[PDB]
Ligand SMILES: O=C(NCc1ccc(S(=O)(=O)c2cc(F)cc(F)c2)cc1)c1ccc2nccn2c1
C-alpha cells in the first residue's frame with residue numbers, strides 16, 4: 001500500500017531541521033519556466049489525478065509512520081526522520097494533510113513562465129510539509145508535457161489538413177496512441193494515454209480509459225476508440241509464401257468495419273502494388289466508406305515510404321483531385337504511418353505530402369515512444385520553487401537567482417494569475433494581486449486540508465484545451 | 473484493481489480471429505535487437521512483471537465482464553474474445569496457460585540474443601502468447617535503466633582507477649535524483665531499482681520497497697542517502713543570510729556527511745568567501761566520515777565543476793595522491809547533479825583528468841538523465857513471433873522488411889548457448905536440439921500461473937558486476 005511518508009526524495013526527510021527557526025509558513029509554486037519546436041504554451045493537466053490518488057483523505061497512519069521510521073533508520077544509517085511532525089498530523093487532523101493547493105483549471109492553455117499552481121501549509125507546525133510533497137506534485141510534468149506535445153502535433157495536423165482539404169474533418173483521429181509497450185510502466189501508460197486523449201480520440205493504450213473514468217469522467221461511455229488491425233505475427237504466422245492468404249483472411253473477417261493491415265512484413269512495395277493492388281483489389285474496391293482498408297507501412301524512411309506507398313496506390317486505384325487541388329485516394333482506402341513518428345517527423349511527412357500534392361485526408365499517424373515516452377521534465381522546464389515564507393510573524397519574498405544561469409531565476413513572493421487588458425496571461429509577484437488592478441485570480445483552491453475542493457470533468461478539460469482553429 | 477484483460481494494446485483484442493485456422497501454438501521471443509554504443513545489456517525486471525501482474529488467478533468473472541463492457545464501447549462493436557477468457561477461468565482457475573523461459577536476472581548479454589521466450593501450453597490459448605506482449609515488452613525499461621546505469625559505472629570505474637589507483641567508493645559515485653523527473657510513482661520504483669543493480673546511492677525511495685517485495689537483499693535496505701539541503705532551505709533565510717543558512721545546516725549535521733547546494737545566488741562567491749573564509753573553521757574541523765559535500769547546480773557542468781575545484785583548492789589544503797592527481801582534504805567533497813547524463817558524465821571526468829583532479833573528489837547525481845531520458849529504441853527491445861504450429865505442423869516464421877534489414881526477426885524455436893570461446897550465441901530453427909552447443913542457458917521462470925524460478929537482488933548484483941570489479 002502507498003505510503004506518502006516514503007514518497008519523497010530522501011534528502012527532504014532532513015529538511016525540517018534546516019529551515020530558519022520560527023518559520024510558520026512555506027509557500028511554493030509550480031511553473032513551466034520560460035527559457036531564453038518552441039512550446040510557448042502548455043496544457044495544464046493531471047493534478048486532479050495526483051490529488052485524488054495520493055494526497056486526499058487519511059494518508060497518515062500509525063503503521064505508516066512506523067514503517068517510514070524503520071526504513072529511514074536503515075536508509076540513512078541514522079535517526080533523522082521527523083516522527084513528531086508526522087504524529088502531529090495524525091493526531092490533530094486524523095492523518096489529513098494540512099495543505100492548501102490553488103491551481104489554474106485543468107485543460108487551460110497557459111504561456112510559459114506563469115504560475116500554474118501554488119502550495120502552502122495551513123498549520124504553522126507543518127511548515128516542512130509544503131516541500132515534502134514537491135516530488136509527488138512535480139510528476140505532474142508528465143501529463144502536462146504529453147498533453148502539450150500532443151496538442152502541438154494537433155496544430156501541425158490541423159494546419160496541413162485545412163490547407164490540403166479545406167476543413168478539419170477527421171482531425172481528432174489523425175494521431176493515434178501506440179505507446180503502451182513503449183512506456184516505462186503500467187501507471188505511466190494510463191497517465192500518458194489520458195493526456196493524449198485531451199486532444200485526440202484514437203488510442204490503443206487501454207489503460208487511459210479507466211484512469212479517465214475514475215478520476216475525471218466523460219458524458220460518453222468512453223473517451224477513446226480503436227478499430228481492428230493486424231500485427232506482424234498475424235501475418236507472418238501464415239508463412240512467408242502466404243502473405244496474400246493472411247491479408248485476404250483478415251479483410252474478410254473484418255469486412256464491415258475499418259481495418260488496418262501492416263503490409264511491410266517482407267516487401268511493402270510488392271504488398272501494395274501486387275497483393276492489394278492486383279491480387280486482392282476486388283476485396284478492397286467493394287468496401288464501404290465507413291469500413292476502409294487502412295494500409296500500414298512500418299519500416300524505411302517514414303517520408304520516403306509514405307510517398308512511395310501513395311504513388312503505388314494512386315496508380316492501382318482511382319484517385320480524385322479535391323477542390324483544393326490535392327490528390328485523394330478512394331474512400332475505401334487509406335494509409336497509417338506508425339513507425340518513427342514524433343513531432344518533428346510528423347511535420348516532415350505532412351509537408352512532404354503537401355509538396356507532392358497529396359491531401360492529408362489520405363493519412364493518419366500512430367505514435368508510441370514519441371508520444372508517451374520520449375519526453376522529459378526539461379522540455380517545458382516544469383519546476384517547483386519556494387517563493388514566500390513567514391518567519392517570526394514576518395512574510396519574506398524568497399527566490400533563487402544563480403549567477404551563471406538567469407534562466408533558472410525563480411519568482412518572488414505570493415503569486416497570482418490574471419488576464420491582461422489584451423486578454424493574455426500575467427503572473428503577479430510579491431502579493432501584488434492583492435492590489436486588485438488585474439481582476440480575479442485565475443488560480444482556484446483545488447485541495448485543502450485533505451479534501452479535494454474543486455474538480456473538472458474530462459469533457460471540460462477537452463473544451464479548455466481546444467485549438468483556436470477549432471474555435472474558429 | 474489491475475485487470476490483465478485491459479492491459480494490452482487495443483488491436484490485440486482482435487487478433488484471435490486473424491491467425492491461421494487450427495493454430496495450436498504461438499511461440500514468441502524478446503531480444504535487444506542488434507544494429508557502436510550499448511553492445512551488451514543487463515537483463516533485469518521480468519521477475520517484477522511476473523509477480524505483480526502475471527501470476528496466480530488473474531482472470532475472474534468480474535474482470536471478464538468489465539473487459540467486455542469496456543471493449544464494446546471502445547470498438548463500438550462486439551469483438552472481444554469472451555469465450556477464450558472464460559475457458560481460462562473455467563479450466564485453469566484463471567491461471568495463465570503460458571510458459572516463459574528467460575536468462576537469469578542480472579546477466580550481461582550482448583545485443584541480438586534471445587533474452588526470454590513465451591508460448592502457450594494449451595492449444596486453445598494460442599492467442600494468449602501475443603496478448604501479453606504489451607505488458608512483457610515494458611521490461612525494456614528496467615533493462616535499459618540498468619544497462620545505461622552500468623555503462624556509466626564503467627566510465628566512472630575507468631577514470632577513478634586511473635586517477636586514484638583503486639575503485640574505492642565507486643558504488644556511491646552516481647546517485648539517483650530521478651524521483652520527480654519520471655512519469656509516475658510506479659516508474660520511479662522500477663527505475664530506481666534498476667539503477668541499484670549497479671550503485672548503492674539513491675534518493676528515489678520507491679525503489680527500496682520494490683526490491684524488498686520482489687527481489688530481496690540480505691541487508692535491511694539496498695540503497696542509502698545522507699542529509700542535504702535544497703534551494704528552499706537556503707533561500708528561505710533571505711538573500712542576505714545565505715551564510716546563516718549554511719552555518720545552521722552544517723551545525724545541525726555536524727557528525728554525518730551533509731551536502732549543501734551552493735549556487736542559489738553566486739556559486740563562486742559561496743565557495744571562495746562563504747565556505748572558503750567565513751565558515752572555513754566549521755569545515756576543517758569535520759570528520760573524514762562526515763565531509764561537507766558542496767553542490768553546484770547551474771552553469772556549464774564541466775566548466776563549473778572545474779572552477780569550483782580550483783576555488784576550493786586555493787582555500788583548502790590540497791594533496792597529491794600516489795597517481796599524481798590533486799585531492800581535496802577528506803572533510804570536503806563535491807557533487808555535480810545538474811545536467812548529468814552518460815555523455816556529460818564522460819565529459820566531466822575526462823575534463824577533471826586533464827586538469828589533474830582525482831575522481832575521488834567528486835560524485836554525480838542524475839535524475840532525468842538516469843531514469844527518464846531513455847526509450848525502447850535505445851537497445852531496440854522487441855517481442856516477435858518466431859514459431860507457430862498450425863494443423864499439427866511447426867512453421868518457422870519471421871519478418872524481414874525489404875527496406876530495413878535491422879528489423880529482421882529470428883526464425884523458429886530459439887535457445888541460448890555458450891560458444892567454444894565462452895561467448896553467447898542464440899541458435900535458431902530449433903538447432904539447439906542438435907546438442908552441438910551444449911545446454912540451453914534459458915530457464916523456465918513462469919509456467920501455468922506460477923513463478924518457477926527467481927533471483928534475489930544480491931544475486932542480480934553479482935551477475936551484473938563489471939569485469940574490472942571481478
Ligand atoms: O493498428 C493498430 N491499432 C488499430 C488502429 C487501426 C486504425 C487506426 S486509424 O488511426 O486509422 C483509425 C482510428 C480510429 F479510432 C478509427 C478509424 F476509423 C481509424 C488506429 C489504430 C496498431 C498498430 C500498431 C501498434 N503498435 C502499438 C499499438 N498498435 C496499434
Ligand SMILES: O=C(NCc1ccc(S(=O)(=O)c2cc(F)cc(F)c2)cc1)c1ccc2nccn2c1
Pocket residue numbers: 009010011644645646647648649650651672673674675696697698699700701729730731765807809835836837839
Ligand atoms: O543531495 C541530495 N541528496 C542527498 C545526497 C547527498 C550526498 C550524496 S553523495 O553521492 O555525495 C553521497 C551518497 C551517499 F550515500 C553517502 C555519502 F557519504 C555521499 C548523494 C545524495 C539531492 C540533491 C538534489 C536532488 N534532486 C533530486 C533529489 N536530490 C537529492
